[PDB]
């Protein structure tokens, strides 16, 4: 059940699993986040409404001067997108707010209002989001990478080991809020427990308990369990709770009933506790020595005196037992301490507690928060209440409360805003229990502690900071507040908020240039998480902790796609099915499980909600109904993974792909690659430059179509219909009768984007693929972009590789590319460089853009027209002129004998200095397009007038073609008027269309309908008169250029770089390479049938770097081209549709269980010929990533062709014509072309420009300056005895500004001497030391 578009070539699809969650729209992060940002949102939640409800209303100094909020608006831009890339504006959208300045009357708190002046005030231009989540800030398409930062809540950290040298670990616990004072708990190595408010001094941690209305009795009964001792007529009985005695010294005879069930000295093993439980002991009679070290909880005083016998939390010695014996107590309370489990911590910290009771504790808090402030009753009350208990001065965000209740094993995920007695006490219990053995510590990386921002929330915060810095000014201008003379816009300033928001979108560690050199690059750049930036941890502070992968990445961030090198792991790329949760933490799909069934309901899980479940594994064969095939299946429960019984799973992975990203899920046979290698593979697939004829992955992974379509490059049909008029520019879809709106149907039209620059200087082209008179279904591609083909992402080209050494040309990783790959121009990649030539305004005068140039005859000026700009199309080369420009330079200041010379030949020395924009030395191109911006203070020249006329012709053509469709829709609606009630069918197609307004009709509601539709027609008329007026006026106006520039002339060269020894190349699995000798055809190897193997890689790179996936891909490719050549023979020897059907059907079934059966008996006889003609280059093959095609499937798919099952053909060398012993592997591997081109990298500099502060080399153009002869190189030269080369390496070649010119004079005059002198850098050092008062001089002898 396929469409008519999908049948262009139906990708053979292995992969055994059924997909149950189709791939989400890959750009959900950017789009949905910026959608939450900018929208009138009738609820106080996120969006701009959040910021405005936060900072407004502004009340003055209580003076009945208020400025409140009403509602805002997003006026449409003045320049739309492509206009805004041409000209250079920020694709903004002017903001508007309805602020409402109210002024209450004095002698009135809320008495009668005296003025409510309601006026709408401008502020800022928020740069809107394109349809592809890519803003346009200054002409270039920029992208704001999602950030990943610590969620405000609670954290229990270790800081294990190194401190204190005893090895003993500390267990600190931090309560970070959204906004307010922190709170920390920590152990000392002496094991007492201490607190600290915001990172200030430590404190005896019981002081905060006491400050919260806790005296020692209830402290000890919160942080401890009770053991009562009894004095029942003889010597110190004890309560026996049976499980109190696991792992403890038996320092006494544990008898019972006068029977000995446990004996002294031993240890109470589980046997003993078992037997005491079975033998029912409850009150054991132990000696006094065992109470001698116990601790007494409650307070005891002589009941006859009221004098304090034992304070709370004192150790009972024998004397105190005696003393309270004579007071009439048979109950005694003792803390159940223990070295293992119920440790003494709060008790011994009370030992450390200097203070005694509540008021003293509040005093100490007041003296630790701020010194010098004398303590006080109410000062202490206010300070302590306002640390953690002030709704104004402290608020966990609701995210804060949610983490704080999920990390305590609480109940409600949402609740209060400030802390409480119970929140603090639960923190402390959790802390002590962490240290007691039960419980564990949340390591940093755990994605339950990495809330994900994105464009929306970050821009919201920047607008927030803007609002605070402006409400300062608002309250200030309200200080002087005249009641009714300042409207609600002189209080504000617009440029503040615009400054903040532009600073974010244009200067950030996030808002960065789109890696727009390959559709996979954009859609793997917009899906991106970053841990750097403002508010995240940067490298120095942190640090190795967050580089790591952590088992909560399984389906939430890709593990095998992260930028290797300087910052690994800080650029985690988001998974395939991942999402941002409601609160923010990354979440992912999982299929629900009933009693024992695998439901098809996908259910989302965040990070903190997972471990309490037990998730199955997607690689589980299930039994045609939703029951597993076994009773025990692999699963993963809490980090660990293991076998579980069938009746225990709760969640199955949505699909085998979800562990990866869109980066590494395109690598076919990813499953057989060492993870570093898939890392480098994805990170070299993000850089493939779009070739000239982008072919297709001959072996793909299923996700490639979704990446091509969901990225913006393909030209996706908005509505299904017939194709009326294709063309290299535009595609005209005639919408069908059912997908067609009721009024003014019309037809959809797509203006493609022909040749044009992207940021990385490549060609972002679009070519139609659906030809004239041809159906298209909704949601289908019309026009392939760069590196797409038929809507299947084709980054590089497939080609014939043969693994074999072949004379050292591929030594380390080098590659040997036969000239059949470069003759065809199949890696010939097109690069569209932009050269600008401004025309500035110096003190001497304005630069000219004349065609009149000195010291260059007609020679270099043959390509220039009458005005100094080159023609569109002249094939400039290295060193020619594109824009003739001359600057007036007075004071020629003639010299000696040069003056004699001018006398000798009378040649008038000109007043003008040539500065024309000449092509960079080396490129060789075609000037595809010249644009001339002009300050509107200059008379536009002749060529700019040509350009204005031409663009205006174009825009007139376009907008008139638009008006035609529109009026056709309105005539349609007119017929829809007549069709009901008195339509005259054939009396309306004969006569002219324009004379339908005067068509007869009875004066019912339908005559008034005709009148109304005539009104609509004339409105459209005047509308497009005035709209073409506005188009002509946008074109005709001057530009608004930088300060002091007359006119800029942009010239778009279009180089075509082919391929040449040095151009890096690479497969997908991470086999790099540097194509190293572009061999003839004859020389290459050739299999017994004749075909020369185009590339020749190296065998020594498959075992050493375990990326055997490239050998399996090579074999699947060889089988694929086997099928291809079989269809080619069946089609060239032209057979029929019948043989083709039987053979393609044999290819598409092919054995093992698959989810792809197509049944070509429904393809019409003429579709299968088209299907063949698209397969005649070779049958594509899918292979979902961790669910690929196992080897034996490949072997049978080879045997379906006629290749040898071994995969290894016997090759004959091309030069000697004699068989390679030991057959080689040959196949069709898909190889990219990385854009580390050679001619971008090559560089050489003999005498260029120079610096200005130190006479060193400095060039610009391609760092047109010498290589850095750094320090380690100087160590090298000193290691050799060579010292002359060093002396000239930093005296003659580099700095000594007489040494270098004398060296050049000597070199030209054929005397290789050198006259060093002394470096100008050291002379600067003498001056910089001497400006300080340090007289450094050089002795002279």
């Amino acid at each position: 059940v396929y469409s008519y578009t999908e049948k262009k070539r139906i990708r053979k699809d292995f992969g055994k699993r059924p997909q149950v969650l189709d791939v989400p729209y890959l750009l959900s992060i950017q789009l949905d986040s910026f959608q939450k940002f900018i929208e009138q949102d009738p609820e106080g939640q996120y969006g701009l409404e959040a910021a405005f409800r936060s900072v407004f209303p502004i009340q003055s100094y209580s003076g009945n001067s208020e400025l409140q909020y009403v509602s805002y608006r997003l006026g449409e831009p003045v320049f739309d997108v492509q206009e805004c890339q041409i000209r250079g504006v920020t694709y903004s959208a002017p903001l508007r707010v309805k602020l409402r300045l109210v002024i209450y009357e004095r002698e009135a708190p809320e008495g009668t209002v005296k003025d409510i002046k309601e006026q709408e005030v401008y502020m800022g231009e928020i740069p809107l989001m394109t349809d592809n989540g890519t803003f346009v800030i200054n002409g270039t398409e920029r992208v704001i990478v999602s950030q990943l930062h610590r969620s405000p809540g609670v954290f229990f950290d270790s800081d294990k080991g190194k401190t204190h040298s005893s090895g003993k670990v500390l267990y600190n616990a931090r309560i970070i809020p959204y906004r307010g004072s922190w709170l920390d708990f920590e152990f000392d190595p002496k094991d007492n427990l201490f607190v600290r408010i915001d990172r200030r001094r430590k404190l005896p941690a019981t002081i905060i308990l006491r400050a919260l209305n806790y005296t020692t009795e209830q402290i000890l009964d919160l942080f401890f369990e009770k053991v009562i001792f009894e004095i029942r007529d003889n010597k110190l009985q004890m309560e026996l709770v049976p499980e109190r005695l696991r792992g403890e010294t038996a320092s006494f005879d544990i008898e019972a009933n006068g029977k000995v069930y446990v004996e002294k000295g031993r240890r109470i093993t589980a046997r003993h506790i078992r037997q005491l439980e079975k033998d029912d002991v409850k009150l054991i009679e132990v000696p006094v020595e065992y109470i001698a070290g116990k601790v007494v909880a409650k307070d005891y005083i002589d009941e006859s005196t009221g004098e304090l016998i034992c304070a709370a939390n004192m150790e009972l010695s024998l004397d105190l037992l005696a003393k309270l014996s004579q007071s009439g107590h048979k109950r005694i309370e003792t803390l159940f301490t223990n070295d293992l489990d119920h440790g003494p911590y709060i008790s011994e910290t009370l030992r450390v507690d200097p203070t005694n009771d509540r008021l003293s504790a509040l005093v100490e808090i007041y003296r630790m928060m701020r010194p010098g402030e004398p303590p006080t009753r109410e000062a202490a009350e206010s300070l302590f209440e306002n640390l953690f208990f002030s709704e104004d001065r402290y608020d966990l965000s609701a995210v804060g409360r949610m983490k704080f209740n999920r990390s305590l094993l609480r109940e409600e995920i949402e609740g209060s805003g400030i802390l409480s007695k119970d929140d603090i006490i639960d923190v402390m219990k959790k802390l002590i229990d962490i240290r007691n053995g039960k419980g564990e510590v949340d390591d940093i990386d755990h994605l339950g502690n990495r809330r994900i921002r994105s464009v929306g929330e970050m821009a919201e915060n920047q607008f927030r900071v803007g609002l605070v810095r402006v409400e300062r000014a608002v309250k200030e201008r309200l200080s002087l507040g005249d009641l009714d003379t300042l409207m609600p816009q002189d209080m504000i300033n617009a440029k503040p908020i615009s400054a903040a928001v532009k600073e974010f979108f244009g200067s950030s560690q996030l808002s960065q240039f789109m890696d727009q050199n390959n559709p996979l690059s954009e859609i793997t750049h917009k899906r991106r998480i970053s841990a750097l930036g403002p508010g995240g941890l940067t490298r120095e502070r942190a640090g190795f902790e967050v580089r790591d992968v952590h088992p909560t990445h399984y389906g939430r961030v890709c593990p095998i796609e992260t930028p290797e090198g300087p910052n690994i792991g800080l650029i985690n790329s988001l998974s395939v099915y991942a999402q941002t949760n409601e609160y923010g933490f990354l979440e992912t799909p999982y299929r629900k499980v009933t009693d024992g069934v695998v439901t098809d309901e996908i259910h989302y899980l965040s990070a903190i909600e997972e471990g309490n479940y037990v998730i199955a594994q997607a690689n589980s064969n299930l039994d045609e109904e939703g029951h597993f095939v076994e009773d025990l299946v692999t699963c993963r429960s809490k980090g660990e993974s293991s076998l579980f019984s069938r009746d225990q799973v709760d969640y199955m992975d949505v699909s085998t792909q979800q562990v990866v990203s869109v980066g590494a899920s395109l690598i076919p046979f990813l499953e057989h690659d060492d993870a570093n290698r898939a890392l480098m593979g994805a990170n070299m697939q993000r850089q493939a430059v779009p070739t000239l004829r982008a072919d297709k992955p001959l072996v793909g992974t299923g996700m490639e179509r979704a990446v091509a379509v969901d990225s913006g490059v393909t030209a996706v049909a908005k509505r299904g219909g017939v194709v009326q008029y294709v063309d290299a520019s535009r595609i005209v879809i005639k919408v069908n009768e059912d997908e067609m709106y009721p009024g003014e149907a019309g037809i959809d039209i797509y203006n493609l984007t022909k040749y044009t620059r992207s940021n990385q200087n490549t060609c972002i082209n679009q070519m139609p693929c659906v030809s004239l008179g041809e159906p298209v279904e909704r949601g289908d591609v019309l026009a392939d972009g760069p590196s797409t083909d038929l809507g299947e992402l084709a980054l590089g080209q497939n080609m014939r590789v043969a693994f074999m050494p072949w004379n050292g040309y591929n030594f380390e990783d080098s590659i040997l590319v036969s000239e059949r790959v470069v003759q065809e121009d199949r890696f010939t990649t097109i690069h569209i460089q932009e050269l600008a030539c401004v025309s500035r305004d110096t003190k001497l005068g304005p630069e000219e853009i004349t065609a009149d140039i000195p010291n260059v005859g007609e020679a270099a000026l043959s390509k220039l027209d009458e005005s100094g700009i080159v023609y569109i199309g002249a094939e400039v080369t290295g060193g020619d002129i594109l824009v003739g420009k001359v600057t007036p330079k007075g004071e020629t200041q003639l010299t000696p004998e040069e003056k004699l010379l001018r006398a000798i030949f009378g040649e008038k020395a000109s007043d003008v200095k040539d500065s024309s924009l000449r092509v960079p030395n080396g490129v060789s191109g075609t000037v595809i397009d010249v644009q001339v911006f002009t300050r509107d203070g200059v008379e536009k020249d002749k060529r700019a007038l040509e350009i204005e006329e031409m663009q205006l012709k174009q825009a007139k053509k376009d907008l008139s073609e638009e008006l035609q469709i529109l009026e056709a829709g309105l005539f349609s609606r007119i017929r829809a008027v007549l069709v009901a009630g008195g339509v005259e069918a054939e009396k309306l197609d004969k006569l002219p269309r324009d004379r339908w307004l005067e068509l007869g009709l009875t004066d019912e509601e339908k005559q008034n309908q005709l009148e109304q539709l005539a009104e609509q027609y004339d409105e459209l008329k005047h509308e497009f008169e005035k709209k073409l007026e506005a188009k002509r006026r946008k074109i005709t106006q001057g530009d608004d250029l930088a300060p002091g520039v007359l006119k800029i002339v942009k010239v778009y060269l279009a180089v075509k770089r082919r391929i040449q020894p040095g151009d890096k190349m690479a497969g997908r699995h991470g086999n790099k390479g540097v194509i190293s000798k572009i061999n003839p055809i004859e020389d290459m190897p050739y299999d017994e049938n004749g075909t020369p193997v185009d590339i020749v890689l190296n065998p020594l790179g498959v075992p050493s770097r375990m990326n055997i996936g490239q050998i399996l891909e090579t074999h699947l490719g060889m089988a694929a081209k086997g099928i291809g050549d079989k269809i080619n023979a069946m089609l060239k020897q032209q057979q029929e549709v019948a043989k083709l059907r039987e053979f393609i059907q044999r290819a598409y079934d092919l054995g093992a269980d698959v989810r792809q059966k197509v049944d070509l008996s429904t393809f019409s006889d003429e579709e299968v010929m088209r299907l063949a003609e698209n397969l005649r280059k070779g049958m594509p093959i899918a292979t979902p990533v961790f669910d690929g095609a196992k080897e034996a499937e490949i072997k049978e798919l080879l045997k379906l062709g006629d290749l040898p099952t071994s995969g290894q053909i016997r090759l004959y060398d091309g030069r000697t014509g004699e068989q390679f012993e030991r057959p080689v592997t040959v196949g069709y591997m898909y190889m990219l072309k990385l854009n580390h081109l050679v001619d971008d990298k090559m560089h050489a500099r003999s005498t260029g420009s120079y610096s200005l502060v130190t006479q060193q080399p400095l060039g610009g153009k391609a760092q047109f300056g010498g290589q850095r002869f750094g320090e380690m190189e100087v160590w090298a030269l000193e290691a050799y005895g060579a010292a002359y080369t060093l002396q000239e390496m930093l005296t003659v070649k580099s700095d000594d500004v007489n040494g270098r010119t004398k060296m050049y004079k000597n070199i030209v005059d054929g005397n290789h001497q050198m006259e060093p002198g002394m470096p100008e850098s050291f002379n600067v050092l003498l001056k910089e030391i001497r400006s300080l008062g340090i007289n450094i001089e050089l002795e002279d002898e």
């Binding site: 670990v169 031993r266 240890r267 093993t269 589980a270 293992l340 053995g437 570093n676 770097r1105």
Partner: protein, 72 residues
Amino acid sequence: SDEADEAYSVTEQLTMTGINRIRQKINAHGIPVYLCEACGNPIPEARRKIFPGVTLCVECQAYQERQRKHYA
């Protein structure tokens, strides 16, 4: 050499040293002990027969392992 080759060497180093630590722990050589090195209880047959020459009863082992779980 490449940047993944060096990472392979480091991964070999890391897992080899970890595994060889944990094989250094387990004894596999008899020194028949017959009752604890701390508590004195008899070590049962099954435990002394799995791990030959193990000085400590089961409970003493769990207890020392738990005091060491907080890393000394």
